[PDB]
Amino acid sequence: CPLMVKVLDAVRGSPAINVAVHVFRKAADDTWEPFASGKTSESGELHGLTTEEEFVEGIYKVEIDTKSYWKALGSSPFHEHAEVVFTANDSGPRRYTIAALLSPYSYSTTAVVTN
Amino acid sequence: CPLMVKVLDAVRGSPAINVAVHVFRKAADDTWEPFASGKTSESGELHGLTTEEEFVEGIYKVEIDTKSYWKALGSSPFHEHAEVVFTANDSGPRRYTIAALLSPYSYSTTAVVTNP
Amino acid sequence: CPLMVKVLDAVRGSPAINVAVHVFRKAADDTWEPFASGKTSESGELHGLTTEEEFVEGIYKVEIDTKSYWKALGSSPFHEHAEVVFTANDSGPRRYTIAALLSPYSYSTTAVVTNP
Amino acid sequence: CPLMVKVLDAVRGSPAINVAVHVFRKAADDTWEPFASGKTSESGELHGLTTEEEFVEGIYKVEIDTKSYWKALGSSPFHEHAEVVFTANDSGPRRYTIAALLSPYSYSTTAVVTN
Number of domains making up chain A: 1
User: Is the CB of residue D6 less than 8 Å from the CB of residue B99?
Assistant: no
Q: Find the DSSP H helices in C16-98.
A: 66-72
User: Is the CB of residue D17 less than 8 Å from the CB of residue D40?
Assistant: yes
Q: What is the DSSP letter of C77?
A: -
Nearest to B17 by CA among C14, A110, C112: C112
User: Could you tell me if residue B68 is left (phi over 0), alpha (psi between -120 and 50 degrees) or otherwise beta?
Assistant: alpha
d(CA A103, CA B107): 14
Those of residues 45-104 in D touching chain C at CB distance below 8 A are: 59, 78-81, 83-87, 101
Where do the DSSP E strands lie in chain C? 3-9, 14-15, 20-26, 32-39, 45-46, 58-64, 79-88, 95-103, 106-114
**Which neighbouring-strand residues pair with A15?**
A8
Dihedral sign for Cα C65, A70, D96, D90, please: positive
DSSP line for B63-106: EE-HHHHHHHTT---SEEEEEEEEEESBTB--EEEEEEEEETTE
User: Is the CB of residue C40 less than 8 Å from the CB of residue C90?
Assistant: no
Within 8 A of A85 by CB-CB distance, chain B residues are 79-81, 83
A11 touches chain C (CB under 8 A): yes
CB contact under 8 A, C13 and A101: no
Q: What is the DSSP letter of A67?
A: H
- For C107, the closest chain A residue by CA position comes to A10
How many residue pairs from chains B and D have C-beta atoms closer than 8 A? 38
What is the CATH classification number for the domain harbouring A26?
Answer: 2.60.40.180
| Neighbour-count burial of D74, counting CB atoms closer than 10 A to its CB (0-12 exposed, 13-18 middle, 19+ buried) | exposed
**Which neighbouring-strand residues pair with A99?**
A6, A110
Residues B60, A108, B20: CA angle, nearest 5 degrees = 50
User: Is B108 assigned to a binding site?
Assistant: yes
Q: Radius of gyration of chain C from Cα atoms?
A: 14
CA A47 to centroid of chain Cα atoms: 11
| Nearest CB partner across the interface for B108, out of A81, A86, A106 | A106
d(CA C47, CA C40): 8
Give me the resolution in angstroms, 1 decimal.
Answer: 1.8
Helix (H) or strand (E) holding A50: none
d(CA C83, CA C93): 22
Residue at B32: amino acid letter: W
User: Is the CB of residue B112 less than 8 Å from the CB of residue B76?
Assistant: no
Helix (H) or strand (E) holding A17: none
- Closest-CA distance of chain A to residue C8, Å: 10
Q: Which domain holds residue D79?
A: 1-115
User: Is the CB of residue C80 less than 8 Å from the CB of residue C104?
Assistant: no
| Neighbour-count burial of C53, counting CB atoms closer than 10 A to its CB (0-12 exposed, 13-18 middle, 19+ buried) | exposed
User: Is the CB of residue C35 less than 8 Å from the CB of residue C41?
Assistant: no
d(CA B15, CA C27): 32
**How far is residue D54 from each of residues D9, D34, D49, D64, measured CA to CA in Å?**
30, 13, 10, 21
CB contact under 8 A, C111 and B13: yes
Which residues have C-beta within 8 Å of that of residue C30, sequence separation ≥ 6? Answer: none
User: Is the CB of residue C4 less than 8 Å from the CB of residue C47?
Assistant: yes
- Closest-CA distance of chain B to residue D74, Å: 12
Buried b (16+ CB within 10 A) or exposed e, B19-33: bbbbbbbbeeeeebe
d(CA C21, CA C33): 14
State the structure-solving technique: X-ray
User: Is the CB of residue B104 less than 8 Å from the CB of residue B90?
Assistant: no
- Closest-CA distance of chain B to residue D25, Å: 31
d(CA C84, CA D82): 7
Pairing of strands A95-103, A3-9: parallel
CB contact under 8 A, B12 and D108: no
- Closest-CA distance of chain D to residue C103, Å: 9
User: Is the CB of residue B57 less than 8 Å from the CB of residue B90?
Assistant: yes
- For C114, the closest chain B residue by CA position comes to B14
d(CA B93, CA B76): 39
User: Is the CB of residue D87 less than 8 Å from the CB of residue D114?
Assistant: no
CB contact under 8 A, D111 and C85: no
Within 8 A of B87 by CB-CB distance, chain A residues are 80
